Structures are given as C-alpha cells and as structure tokens.
C-alpha cells in the first residue's frame, strides 16, 4: 500500500510505499509473549536473608514437661516456621532465575507483527487510542527531527487530528495498593509513539503518555505496550523506510 507523507504544517506532501512488514499478519499471542519476556527480564532478584530466624541456639525440651517439642530459648519458641520470629519456610530466593528466554526468530517475528498492527486503524482504535483519522500510522517528513519545542509538536498533532490521544493520557491514576509505598503511586494511559531515525524526539517526549523511539531499535513494547497490539504511531519518512528491514 501507499502511506501519505505530511509536512510540519500538517499538509499532505506526497507519499511513499508502505513497506511489506506492515502486511505481516497480526499475531497478538506472539506479541504478548515477547512483551512478557521484556517485562520479566528487567525484574530484580530478591529474597529474604538466608539466616533470618536461624540466629538462635534454641533447643527443644522433648518429652516430660507437658509441652510441644518446639525449640525454645529463654522460654520463647524460636527458629521453626510455625514459631513467631522463626524462619520463613519457603521464602523468595535470590538464586531463582527470574528471566525468560525467547528465540531470536520468534521475537523478531513479534516485532514485525507489532509493526503491522500499527497499520490497522480499526485495531489502533480497539486498543483505546483516540483520533479522528482514517490513515494510520502517521507518516511525517524528516524535518520533524529538527523540532525543539514541545508545543510545536502539539500544533502538528492537532493539525493531524491525532492530539485527542494526548488528552486521554493526560490523566494520571493513583493506583490501589502498597505500590505507593515503594514509589509506584502513579500510572497513566499509553499515548503516541514517535519513531524517528537519528535521535529520539526530545521535543515530543514529555507529551502525556508519549514514547519516543528510533527505527533501528524500536521494540515490541514500544509498538504494543502491555502486549496490546495497535498503538497509535507516527513514523518519520526515513524511520518508516529503515523499519522495513527489521
């Protein structure tokens, strides 16, 4: 198919061949597997102190005093898992491998499939993104990489009738649960992904829910946050071309 290119004013400025990868059949299961792995692979190893609860010479009295054979020290039950202040029976272990392997071919296939989901407006809308547009992804001239002000990107997005999505992402959610006590109080909707070719767009990055990426290393998570295919994206003419041989 053919993708329409847009200038920094939001006006049509020619068109290019939408690369074959965008024809890759959408495979949500493979995409989800790839995202599950990237998410797992960044998780840190943890586990309670291996000696926790074991620092005691507590002994059991055995039979004779009308009591349960539970190790005691200074009249207090110690060590055993059923004892308050005792060890943890089957606690988290640092030695545990918390990573997930994924074949290169299988992962690359998911990257391509996520790229293709970006070319389907119905899917992009099913994912949740708000926009008044028929064509998708949004293709823009390489001059986009020269923008500096965040607001100059706002003007372009409004002109491209794609800014509605940023309004959707302009709502933080204060999560339920103790994540808050560990620095995970907020969360917010994922909006537009900007794919450039030289350096990620500094001008578009602070936009609510926006994610910036480069054609050579844009991944499954960029294209399908949380494993959900069809993210509202905006490529750069050069980015769109380079993303073809991924």
Q: According to the binding rule CB under 5 A, does residue 55 interact with Na ion?
A: yes
Least distance in angstroms from the C-beta of 88 to Mg ion? 6
Question: 18 vs 37, which CB is nearer to Na ion?
Answer: 37
| Size of site (CB under 8 A) for other proteins | 9
Least distance in angstroms from the C-beta of 57 to Na ion? 8
Asked whether the beta carbons of 42 and 132 are under 8 A apart, the reply is no
Which long-range contacts does 7-12 make (Cβ < 8 Å, 24+ apart)?
Answer: 7/140, 7/141, 7/143, 8/140, 8/141, 8/143, 8/144, 8/147, 8/156, 9/156, 9/159, 10/156, 10/159, 10/160
Single residue of 11, 12, 25, 89 touching other proteins by CB under 8 A: 25
Least distance in angstroms from the C-beta of 125 to other proteins? 19
Question: 69 vs 205, which CB is nearer to RNA?
Answer: 205
Question: 25 vs 64, which CB is nearer to Sr ion?
Answer: 64
Q: What is the C-alpha to C-alpha distance for residues 75 and 41, in angstroms, rounded to an integer?
A: 46
Q: According to the binding rule CB under 8 A, does residue 27 interact with other proteins?
A: yes
Q: According to the binding rule CB under 7 A, does residue 154 interact with RNA?
A: yes
The DSSP code sequence of 1-40 is -EEEEE-TTS-EEEEEEPPGGGGSPP-HHHHHHHHHHHHH
Interface region with Na ion, contact rule CB under 5 A, candidates 44-52, 132-140, 173-181, 190-198: 44-52
Q: According to the binding rule CB under 8 A, does residue 29 interact with other proteins?
A: yes
Instruction: Annotate each residue in 44-83 with x if it binds Sr ion (CB under 5 A) or - if it does not, as one string.
Output: -------------------x--------------------
Least distance in angstroms from the C-beta of 134 to RNA? 26
Q: What is the C-alpha to C-alpha distance for residues 191 and 189, in angstroms, rounded to an integer?
A: 6
Residue 75 burial (CB count, 10 A): 5
Q: According to the binding rule CB under 5 A, does residue 45 interact with Na ion?
A: yes
Least distance in angstroms from the C-beta of 105 to Sr ion? 7
Asked whether the beta carbons of 98 and 45 are under 8 A apart, the reply is yes
Least distance in angstroms from the C-beta of 143 to RNA? 17
The residue ranges that bind Sr ion (CB under 5 A) are 63
The residue ranges that bind Mg ion (CB under 5 A) are 53
């Amino acid at each position: 198919m053919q993708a329409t290119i847009y200038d920094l004013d939001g006006n049509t400025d020619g068109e290019v061949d939408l690369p074959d990868v965008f024809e890759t059949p959408v495979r949500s299961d493979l995409i989800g597997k790839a995202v599950r792995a990237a998410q797992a692979n960044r998780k840190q190893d943890y586990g309670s102190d291996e000696y926790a609860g074991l620092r005691t010479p507590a002994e059991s009295f055995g039979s004779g005093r009308g009591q349960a054979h539970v190790p005691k020290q200074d009249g207090r039950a110690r060590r055993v898992p059923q004892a308050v202040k005792g060890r943890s029976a089957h606690p988290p272990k640092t030695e545990k491998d918390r990573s997930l392997d994924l074949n290169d071919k299988e992962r690359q296939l998911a990257v391509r499939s996520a790229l293709a989901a970006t070319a389907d407006a119905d899917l992009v809308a099913d994912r949740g993104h708000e926009f008044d547009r028929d064509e998708v992804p949004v293709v823009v001239s390489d001059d986009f990489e020269d923008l500096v002000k965040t607001q100059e990107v706002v003007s372009l997005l409004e002109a491209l009738d794609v800014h509605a999505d940023i309004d959707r992402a302009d709502e933080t959610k204060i999560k339920a649960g103790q994540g808050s006590a560990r620095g995970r109080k907020y969360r917010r909707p994922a909006s537009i992904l900007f794919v450039t070719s030289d350096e990620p767009s500094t001008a578009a990055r602070n936009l609510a829910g926006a994610d910036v990426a480069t054609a050579s290393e844009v991944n499954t998570e960029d294209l399908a946050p949380g494993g959900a295919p069809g993210r509202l994206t905006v490529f750069t003419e050069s980015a769109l071309a380079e993303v073809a041989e991924r």
